[PDB]
Amino acid sequence: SKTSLDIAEELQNDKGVSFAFQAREEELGAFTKRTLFAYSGDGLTGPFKAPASAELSSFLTAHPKGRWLIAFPLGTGIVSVDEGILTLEISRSLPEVGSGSSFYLTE
Amino acid sequence: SKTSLDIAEELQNDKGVSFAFQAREEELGAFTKRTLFAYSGDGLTGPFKAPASAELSSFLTAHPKGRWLIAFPLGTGIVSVDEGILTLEISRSLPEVGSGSSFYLTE
Amino acid sequence: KTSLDIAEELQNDKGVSFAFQAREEELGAFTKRTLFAYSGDGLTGPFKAPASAELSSFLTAHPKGRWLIAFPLGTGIVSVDEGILTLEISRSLPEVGSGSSFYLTE
Known part of the structure; x- marks a missing residue:
């Protein structure tokens, strides 16, 4: 059970x-x-x-669905990337986002 | 911290x-x-x-509740095993399952 | 690099x-x-x-001062005041199950 990638980054919008x-x-x-x-x-x-960084974009693009369904405490999101721009769309407005994760497993 | 087990497998139903x-x-x-x-x-x-495999079945059987309550983005499930058959029951029909995890901690 | 990994069991008066x-x-x-x-x-x-001294200082360190947490049947907020952990919930929960809350900081 080996970790081959572990990256982190902070993104900010114009607002x-x-x-x-x-x-x-x-x-x-x-x-x-x-x-x-x-x-x-x-x-x-x-x-x-x-x-998003090139390495994060590459990671995000690799999903079999081409996007990442993700549960946060107060609503649901979909994360996608297009031309190096990350978009997180949300099912409802969120007074607070909090934390969530989304994974897939493949062989 | 030390990991004593880490296994993965793919299951498919008749449909x-x-x-x-x-x-x-x-x-x-x-x-x-x-x-x-x-x-x-x-x-x-x-x-x-x-x-399910024998190893997965033994793992799933060990839960103190005998089943695994699990949150997915769009609804809740319960995973159990009986005679080596895994069943995942869901609270509502799910257009997409996505990912989730369920854990317990014990002394 | 995991620089901390602690676990404990807590029980209330009920x-x-x-x-x-x-x-x-x-x-x-x-x-x-x-x-x-x-x-x-x-x-x-x-x-x-x-909560232990170590769990308390870990919980105190969050930028919001409390931990928004999703469980399968409802939402919680975990906080600590003078070594007492409180978990407040959005609705009564027939079963709590498991969940996690994290933050990432530079």
Whole structure:
């Protein structure tokens, strides 16, 4: 059970909302698990959009669905990347985002 | 901290739905944590049933409640095993399952 | 680099039992702190119990001063005041189950 990628970065939009993301990749024999962790202390009225690093973009793009369904305490999000820009869309406005994670396992 | 077990396997039901499960055991001094991770890209209309490996079955049986309450983004499930058949029951039909985990800690 | 990984069991005056695990990890310029919580019990109202010195300072260190946490059937907020942990819940919970709350900081 080896970790082959473990990166973290802070993204911010133009309205001053900020998120921290962590991308982790693990090998488990025949399987690989990829996990995205997300944290913000801010509220979100609508989608969060910000430039992501190339390594984070590459990680995000690799998902079989091409996006990441993610549960936060007060609502549901989908994280995607397009031309190096990360978007997190939310199911309802969130007074506070808090933390969540989203993973897939593949062989 | 030390990991004594970390296994993964893919299960499929008769109607084409597939889940990946990872079972992890960690020792934290006097405590042991056991975590089940579950992922499916598919939707679930009703309960998911499929044969589990002996090692996964033994892991799932060890829970103090004899089953695993698990949150997915769009609803709640309960994972149990009976005679080596894993069943995941869900609180509502799910257009997409996504990922979730369920753990317990014991002394 | 895991720089902290502690676990303890807490019980209230009504025999509800919780296990907590506090983990701190270092990822380059970032620190991640995760609180894991588990109870097999139901919870009618807030859970209060004394926490270790180490668990208390870990819980105090959050930028919001409290930990928003998702469980399968409802939402909680974990906080500490003078070594007493409180977990407040958004609705009564027939069973608590497991959840975790983390933050990532530069």
